[PDB]
Design a protein around this ligand. Structure first.
Ligand SMILES: N[C@@H](CCC(=O)N[C@@H](CS[C@@]1(Cc2ccccc2)NC(=O)[C@](S)(CO)NC1=O)C(=O)NCC(=O)O)C(=O)O
Ligand SMILES: N[C@@H](CCC(=O)N[C@@H](CS[C@@]1(Cc2ccccc2)NC(=O)[C@](S)(CO)NC1=O)C(=O)NCC(=O)O)C(=O)O
Lengths: 238, 237
């Protein structure tokens, strides 16, 4: 179809939906990294991700998605899938690799822990929530297995954060796009949604609190809850 | 402690014995190694549950990589098939032939690579897990995962019907996005899922075009053969 009247690309545009307890856990990831790097950006609140105009931006028809100007400003490019939005923002805006990785060694571990989330906890959590409340019929045995698979992912993260000096998932010294991608599915509130006691993974809990105390993370959680509840319900925010 | 025959004089790719279902992820890094002509060893892991292997991949699966850092100071590791592709591209694809030359190329490569990593990859794995490995058969779950595979095929079909779009990410050449997607988007794997792959003609054409690449042929031949040659387990000659 046609782009809405109010959709223009003068800078990075992050596509989101109306903030709810379960609508923000993927969209908050690129928003954390934008807040961390202080990247100039707009927010577009999509009413319907099923709308044909949106599929042209993200053929998977989900948020988050990004439209941005190419480095020279002549062309517009796109990023979609939360992990891909983190990789794009790091590529375009994190030139000294503070969150992307400064060398092959740092990027090897960042990509390991980022991909572990993208392949395992991320999709498992998405399937858990889908079967738990979106699938027309309730399938408790499938829901229970997916819940059990989440505990195995928590076990792997817990083991990593028990290693000497390992303050963050990828690097010892600082948080990376691996930590940002993992945080929304490895914090107390999300653990409680899954029906899990988060205190059973103490180093992972400590890690999640340490991440949550970062000012950029606080600002991202604030803003993502508010999107679509302000003066403008849908479209390009002021 | 590591086995005596495990040494890292070059990139070491960890695999298991080649079977009908054991190679769909390990073949991915092997394809890119073959494409770039990276010097490498193959280590056939008998038990991925072995404590020594959990030190290399805490997720206890193949593929996994041990390699020397470019400066030679560190022994790096890569694990998760998508991450092994990202590492090999980072360390050995100087010109970004498979990794992407600029921000614009990498934007689309990372889009289609991640779509596989998050959607078709894990959906396929969950399908096979419930279909044959879960103690109980759950037909309604298996059907929904099968339905989700067709939705991913539909997305890939739509992409390959765009003007001049010969590959998933870039128009002109295949990338690590194409390598990651191929093993779960070819006729043999489509048949395993109980799907008729002719229903996605551009996707089938793409899968044939990929399969005709010499690096891809060599990768498929070698991955099937691992553990069935002179040596059953450990470092191959
Ligand atoms: N693999 C994707 C999954 C993204 C996803 O699940 N997005 C959800 C909101 S979470 C969505 O678009 N929801 C529409 C609604 O809430 O109606 C990613 O990691 O980006
Ligand atoms: N997220 C990771 C997961 C890799 C992984 O699952 N590796 C499996 C064999 S790869 C496959 C393929 C496949 C899946 C579905 C349909 C066809 C092929 N084969 C499998 O048999 C299993 S183990 C089934 O769950 N899972 C897999 O992903 C392994 O280590 N097996 C050891 C053994 O048990 O001896 C990645 O993408 O790298």
């Amino acid at each position: 179809s046609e782009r809405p009247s109010d959709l223009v690309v003068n800078r990075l545009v992050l596509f989101v939906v109306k903030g709810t307890a379960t609508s923000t856990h993927n969209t908050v990831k690129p928003l954390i990294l934008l807040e961390e790097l202080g990247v100039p950006h707009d927010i577009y609140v999509v009413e319907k991700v099923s709308a044909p105009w949106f599929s042209e931006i993200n053929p998977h028809k989900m948020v988050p998605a990004i439209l941005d100007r190419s480095p020279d400003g002549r062309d517009t490019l796109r990023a979609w899938e939360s992990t891909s939005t983190l990789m794009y923002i790091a590529d375009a805006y994190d030139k000294d690799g503070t969150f992307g990785g400064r060398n092959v060694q740092e990027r090897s571990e960042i990509n390991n822990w980022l991909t572990l989330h993208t392949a395992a906890l991320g999709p498992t959590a998405k399937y858990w929530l889908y079967f738990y409340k979106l699938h027309p019929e309730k399938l408790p045995k499938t829901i229970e297995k997916l819940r059990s698979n989440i505990t195995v992912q928590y076990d792997i993260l817990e083991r990593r954060l028990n290693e000497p000096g390992q303050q963050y998932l990828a690097l010892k010294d600082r948080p990376t796009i691996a930590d940002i991608a993992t945080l929304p599915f490895a914090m107390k509130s999300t653990a409680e949604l899954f029906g899990l006691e988060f205190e059973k993974w103490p180093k992972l809990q400590e890690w999640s609190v340490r991440m949550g105390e970062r000012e950029a993370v606080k600002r991202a959680w604030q803003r993502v809850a508010g999107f679509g509840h302000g003066e403008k319900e849908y479209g390009m925010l002021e």
